[PDB]
Amino acid sequence: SAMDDEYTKLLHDGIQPVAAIDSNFASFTYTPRSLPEDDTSMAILSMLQDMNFINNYKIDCPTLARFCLMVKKGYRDPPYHNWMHAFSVSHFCYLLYKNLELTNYLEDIEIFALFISCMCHDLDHRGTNNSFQVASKSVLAALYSSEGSVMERHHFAQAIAILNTHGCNIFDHFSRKDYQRMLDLMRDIILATDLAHHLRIFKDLQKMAEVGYDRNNKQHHRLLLCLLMTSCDLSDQTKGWKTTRKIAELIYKEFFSQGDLEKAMGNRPMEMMDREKAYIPELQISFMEHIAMPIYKLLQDLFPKAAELYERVASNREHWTKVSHKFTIRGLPSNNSLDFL
Numbered sequence: 001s002a003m004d005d006e007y008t009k010l011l012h013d014g015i016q017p018v019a020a021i022d023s024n025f026a027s028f029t030y031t032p033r034s035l036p037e038d039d040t041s042m043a044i045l046s047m048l049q050d051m052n053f054i055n056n057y058k059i060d061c062p063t064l065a066r067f068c069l070m071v072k073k074g075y076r077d078p079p080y081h082n083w084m085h086a087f088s089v090s091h092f093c094y095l096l097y098k099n100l101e102l103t104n105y106l107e108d109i110e111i112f113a114l115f116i117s118c119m120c121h122d123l124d125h126r127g128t129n130n131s132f133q134v135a136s137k138s139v140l141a142a143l144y145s146s147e148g149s150v151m152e153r154h155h156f157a158q159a160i161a162i163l164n165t166h167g168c169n170i171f172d173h174f175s176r177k178d179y180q181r182m183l184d185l186m187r188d189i190i191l192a193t194d195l196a197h198h199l200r201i202f203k204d205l206q207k208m209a210e211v212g213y214d215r216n217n218k219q220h221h222r223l224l225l226c227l228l229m230t231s232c233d234l235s236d237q238t239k240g241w242k243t244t245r246k247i248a249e250l251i252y253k254e255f256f257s258q259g260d261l262e263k264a265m266g267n268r269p270m271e272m273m274d275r276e277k278a279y280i281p282e283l284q285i286s287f288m289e290h291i292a293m294p295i296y297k298l299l300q301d302l303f304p305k306a307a308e309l310y311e312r313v314a315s316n317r318e319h320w321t322k323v324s325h326k327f328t329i330r331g332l333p334s335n336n337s338l339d340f341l
Ligand SMILES: Cc1cc(N2CCC[C@@H](C(=O)Nc3ccc4ccccc4c3)C2)n2ncnc2n1
Pocket: 195, 233, 234, 235, 236, 237, 247, 248, 251, 272, 283, 284, 286, 287, 290, 291
């Protein structure tokens, strides 16, 4: 059993200091995808420790070690929605904690729930979207299509299935009320990763940013958690151009594979999932403009120290404009051949 040996070391070796992971590990400039995948479960532990969640919530170490490994094992390997995505999304949550003073805004348990949700938020993704589940009449659509957010409901349900696995319930010593709270938070935060949900609450997010965050307003806590979750989920776009480029490759590999399947089903894919129609620079500019930039502008409005995140996203969008000409074939292809006609 690979997991068992991995568990043994994770549990008995000690939790590595977060600075020992990387000297800039707690910086917005750090790219968590740089971390070797073999090191990420230990890094999860290091972040949990550094945020003092292990001590504060008296988390049983053997349970926590099993839990983190089970979460890791609960991701498949599509090009984008794999464990390294969830790891990088969790890392950003950690960055938010280390850089933005979330304790002035959120309860301890809410911040804890946010991190755990980040770990779990894409569990068992198959690299297809919600519409595909319905179109392909998948088991997940049979379960959840009547409620919407099919994949996100599945991710949440997988998170709970891991909790309910013997030896993996990191919350099983919580009071009944705290346990109920935690799972309720996990539901809300994971469902909030449906970008359809984000677009639906965006005006409320705007209004909250307009009037000003009210720590006494329970709906403000819920809205902020949604915004932070989305911010973690899209946080690849806040890194350097190179990350942005690689992430685009991964996302479109995944999209186009879905598109191939939709064509094999007799359905016409979304333009952005059709490898014969998708024009990636324009698609990425649209995504940055209509989705990512507004999110990090909201985040900046709420947290002035997040300004650099927004400006980096704006920058990456500018870079798509500048490299777009390169998608037009000038001269001959590099093989000197017009055979592709
Ligand atoms: C970090 C990151 C994450 C991410 N998505 C996360 C959410 C689900 C997926 C999704 O809806 N993509 C979308 C959504 C809306 C779009 C609108 C116009 C043009 C393209 C669009 C692509 C992919 N994308 N998408 C592209 N670059 C990304 N970078």
